[PDB]
Design an enzyme around this catalytic site. Structure first.
Site, mmCIF file in Angstrom:
data_model
loop_
_atom_site.group_PDB
_atom_site.id
_atom_site.type_symbol
_atom_site.label_atom_id
_atom_site.label_comp_id
_atom_site.label_asym_id
_atom_site.label_seq_id
_atom_site.Cartn_x
_atom_site.Cartn_y
_atom_site.Cartn_z
ATOM 1 N N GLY A 142 35.767 13.976 -17.489
ATOM 2 C CA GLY A 142 34.880 14.440 -16.414
ATOM 3 C C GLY A 142 34.804 13.762 -15.058
ATOM 4 C CB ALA A 143 35.394 10.096 -14.603
ATOM 5 N N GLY A 203 0.787 -1.243 0.022
ATOM 6 C CA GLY A 203 -0.005 0.134 -0.100
ATOM 7 C C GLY A 203 0.884 1.081 -0.054
ATOM 8 N N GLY A 204 0.255 2.272 0.576
ATOM 9 C CA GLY A 204 0.943 3.588 0.535
ATOM 10 C C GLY A 204 2.054 3.927 1.692
#
Ligand SMILES: O=CCCCC[C@@H]1SC[C@@H]2NC(=O)N[C@@H]21
Ligand SMILES: O=CCCCC[C@@H]1SC[C@@H]2NC(=O)N[C@@H]21
Lengths: 131, 489, 489
Positions: free
Chosen positions: C385-386, C150-151
């Site tokens: 960019g790593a 459920g929620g």
């Protein structure tokens, strides 16, 4: 009045009434004598630069139409292999308690085989084929 | 005199300076730095120095309000960044941080400059840090006019909104050559990172424009909405429209059948002022609508479901879209107005295999963390956790309203009837589902509990919204002390 | 006297009270509220009232330090929440917000209680708001011992860490009945939301345990690391281990060939104290390692790449994992130590179709926003960019170190040679790639620019880390004023 339809203009004795539909800040949708036009209002820079702008042509495809989403076909409107015109509803899928209605955007006729009532298949199949 | 730009225009493309001239006011651009060289001294680069060094940075002025901007230049070295190009951008961003002014950048770089070595990485890192630090202080908008590859793609990502030009722009991390080298598939640049791909598939681009001219014309309109800084108030513009304009067409928008669909724009448009909607991400996750609009001359934020597409069901992409919009709107003190129509969450294995639990929590976190005034209107239905997520009254909501034919229940009538009677006599469907829907699928129970302020006629929505938004102009709410939150990424 | 628990144990399962007894100290649990009823008066629920009302909330005490906890009860009404169950949890969280104490919850609920109507939704909303407000103030840990549907699934999601029990636990938003109803596929509960699925596929669960007993035993060990609150300092425990212990085995870990792989744990383990690693998410995105560890008796955070799996390449899942870990570690003033070995980002169409641009920016944002002391060690390589993302010196890093055989370059030698000589004479490969790798694929250039503090022998890493972490104990850095950031979701 800003963002309103009616526009009363009177030069000397002559009087005219035009309408304002909408705009995208380079093109104005204005109505003259009960007819829609699109006037372009641009400055010196925009005018001198609008020559150097690509004008691509959109895809003109007259082929089969597919269902965007899965569902169930409960009602059909058009007949197999007859005339079809723009804006005509074609059929209605029902999904998760909701009947949609995909229509024919634009075309003259079709050549295809209809998907029968209650065919809970969908999954982006070819419901109607335009040829 | 039209020298040295004939080569550019011949390829049906505009120049950086022309774009800057089109954006700002006719004569209010003051270029900041113009005589700067790369001082590289490697790989035969000691020659061919350039005065501008491939960047145009200035101040400008839009609609009488200040701005800051920079534009890449494709003719000079392909627009590559360097130890020297990034210095100008850093100076501009620092100055726009001291003064409460936003920044707008037109990206055109072809990648890093190899001849500088790791200095390009240094410049990229400095720009990334400035973007990270100043996000939430001054609004940042980015437009991509040409190629944008390599690691330079990350700085537009951190910015609040990214727009794309249709014919001659693309963006991706790695080129198709490497993809062919490792995987063996031949994919073109447009097939990999074209504007359509990022408009529909990845959800990175916030919009697409057909031409540069239209891009500038609508970028000015977008700028007219934003507040100048973090501490400045929401702008208010004069407007002849008034809250007493009659809207009685809302009484008929909702069909009397529960299985028929309708367009939520027919509800959105009457409430806001005429011709004042600026949709954000129009082609991505169409079951939810987000954008900016004006109510009585002040800019507000709009977030509404749409039963036209997929029965208005929440999803992963819709959750991400709404979460980003709410976070940005709250960061700069912009009121939020929401329209609710949701039957629940989209059921499917792919959803759990993709992490619905993480993504659906982002919208709830954004709605609960927000402290700006909120107004909520429940038109037809709200079930399960979806009712909780979409700005329920318990999440410190200011005012909540419902329409006379609304429904607020735990779940659909069928499931409730099944769970409430395990092995009850057969045919229980007919005399139980109807009764349960009649008794508890109505706003009377939720109004009895106190979850909606009042049940209103649909013709009074504009009046109520204007009244509440005028009264709530000076709310001051604060969260407990934190270094920062921990949002579910 | 072993009454009323024989029915439970017969199904090879434990009880809530037994779990609470196992977690805390032998005799330091003081149950807070025990005589509370549901007062529902609907659908034949006026009878069968229960004293505890399905919840056990108390205070307890672990390792001499205070705690707060609550546990669901499966025997009573299936563990469903109500207007009354949620009140106790709200009171506990509010009290743990006033006092700097964390909260730990053992979830077992079968879903919402239908017989209360929308009151269950009200309780869920209140719990969600408390979790949202207090995240980043007090650490929150959640363990799932049984069904959770459920929620109610959303509140564990907002919590910092979620753990799962192997045989008899699952979690998902929608049940398989609805999936069968709409899509038509028959999937079991375990196949849908079993612990393995969330351990490997969705990335929600932070770990899995074989038994409840082992779960408690290791949860105590995890609790021994955490700080008590937001304002309290990092705990320091006595330890006989010392910084002068000899580690010369690090001189041989890195192979002399550039295409051979090695295990990064062989570098991680010598530096930290003996038998003091607690890996987080061990079975998800194995190319990156995250967890907690102690250095000279104080807890630190560990984030390192692994060339064993997929050549240690950054990705979507790795980015999300590292971003969440960094954000949590910084929120509570915990030092960060990173080991860098990355050739770049994973190339592929699926990556761009899945939004690499958004996800890869999260790690960069988390690293740049952080203000805790950082230590970085580059063992072998860092490209593109790593290198920028993995805590480079330009992102306000404190101290950066490299090993004598490292490499820091813009990209691989082949691509640089290709771009630097367009149509140069054939066979250029042999006499250009070797020269370029010799001249610029070495830490000498990066050291000349000033991007690494010093080049060190691999045998001095423990000494340097202990010295720097001792000196940096009292750093005070602050970001510009913001209501909150705007992270790329
Ligand atoms: O009655 C069987 C199917 C009902 C589905 C109702 C909609 S579909 C998606 C969402 N999830 C639910 O549990 N209910 C709604
Ligand atoms: O030389 C052709 C393939 C080289 C790939 C090198 C690795 S694979 C993933 C990552 N992306 C790159 O561009 N380089 C690395």
């Amino acid at each position: 009045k800003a963002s309103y339809p009616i526009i009363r203009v009177k030069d000397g004795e002559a009087e005219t009434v035009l309408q304002f539909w909408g705009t995208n800040e380079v093109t104005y949708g204005m109505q003259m004598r009960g007819t829609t036009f699109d006037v372009n209002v641009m400055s010196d820079l925009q005018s001198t630069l609008a020559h150097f702008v690509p004008i691509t042509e959109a895809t003109t495809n007259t082929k089969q139409i597919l269902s965007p989403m899965p569902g169930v076909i409960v009602a059909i409107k058009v007949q197999p292999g007859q005339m079809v015109v723009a804006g005509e509803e074609l059929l209605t899928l029902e999904a998760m308690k909701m009947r949609n209605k995909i229509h024919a955007q634009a075309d003259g006729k079709v050549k295809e085989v209809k998907v029968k009532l209650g065919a809970t298949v969908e999954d982006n199949e070819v419901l109607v084929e335009l040829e | 005199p039209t020298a040295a730009e004939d080569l550019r225009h011949k390829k049906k493309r505009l120049t950086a300076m022309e774009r800057v001239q089109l954006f700002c006011d006719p004569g209010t651009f003051r270029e900041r730095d113009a005589l700067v060289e790369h001082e590289c001294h490697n790989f035969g680069m000691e020659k061919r120095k350039v005065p501008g060094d491939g960047f145009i940075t200035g101040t400008g002025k839009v609609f009488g309000r200040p701005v800051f901007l920079f534009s890449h230049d494709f003719t000079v070295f392909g627009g590559s960044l360097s130890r020297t190009n990034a210095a100008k951008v850093v100076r501009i961003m620092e100055e726009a941080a001291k003064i409460g002014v936003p920044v707008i950048g037109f990206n055109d770089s072809g990648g890093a400059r190899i001849h500088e070595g790791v200095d390009s990485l240094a410049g990229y890192a400095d720009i990334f840090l400035r973007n990270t630090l100043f996000s939430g202080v001054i609004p940042q908008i980015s437009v991509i006019m040409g190629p944008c590859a390599g690691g330079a793609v990350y700085s537009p990502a951190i910015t609040d909104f990214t727009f794309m030009v249709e014919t001659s722009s693309y963006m991706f991390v790695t080129g198709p050559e490497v993809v062919s080298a490792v995987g063996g598939k031949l994919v073109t640049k447009d097939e990999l990172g074209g504007p359509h791909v990022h408009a529909t598939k990845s959800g990175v681009s916030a919009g697409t424009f057909p031409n540069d001219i239209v891009a500038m014309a609508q970028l000015r309109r977008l700028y007219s909405y934003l507040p100048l800084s973090n501490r400045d108030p929401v702008p208010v513009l004069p407007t002849a429209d008034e809250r007493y304009r009659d809207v009685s067409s809302l009484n008929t928008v909702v069909p009397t059948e529960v299985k028929e669909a309708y367009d939520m724009r027919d509800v959105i448009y009457p409430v806001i002022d005429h011709d004042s909607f600026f949709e954000i991400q129009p082609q991505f996750a169409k079951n939810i609508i987000c954008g900016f609009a004006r109510v009585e001359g002040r800019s507000v934020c709009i977030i509404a479901n749409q039963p036209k597409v997929q029965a208005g069901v929440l999803d992963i992409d819709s959750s991400v879209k709404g979460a980003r919009m709410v976070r940005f709107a709250d960061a700069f003190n912009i009121p939020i107005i929401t329209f609710v129509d949701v039957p629940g969450f989209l059921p499917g294995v792919q959803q759990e295999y993709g992490g619905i639990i993480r993504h659906g929590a982002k919208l709830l976190y954004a709605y609960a963390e927000a402290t700006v005034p909120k107004v909520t209107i429940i038109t037809r239905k709200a079930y399960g956790g979806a009712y909780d997520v979409m700005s329920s009254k318990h999440l410190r909501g200011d005012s909540n309203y419902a329409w006379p034919h609304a429904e607020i229940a735990v779940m659909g009538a069928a499931g409730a009837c099944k769970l409430l009677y395990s092995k009850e006599t057969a045919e229980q469907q007919a005399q139980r589902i109807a009764d349960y829907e009649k008794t508890f699928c109505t706003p009377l129970s939720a109004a009895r509990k106190g979850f909606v302020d009042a049940v209103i006629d649909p013709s009074e929505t504009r009046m109520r919204v204007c009244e509440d938004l005028e009264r709530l102009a000076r709310k001051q709410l604060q969260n407990p002390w934190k270094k920062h939150g921990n949002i579910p990424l």
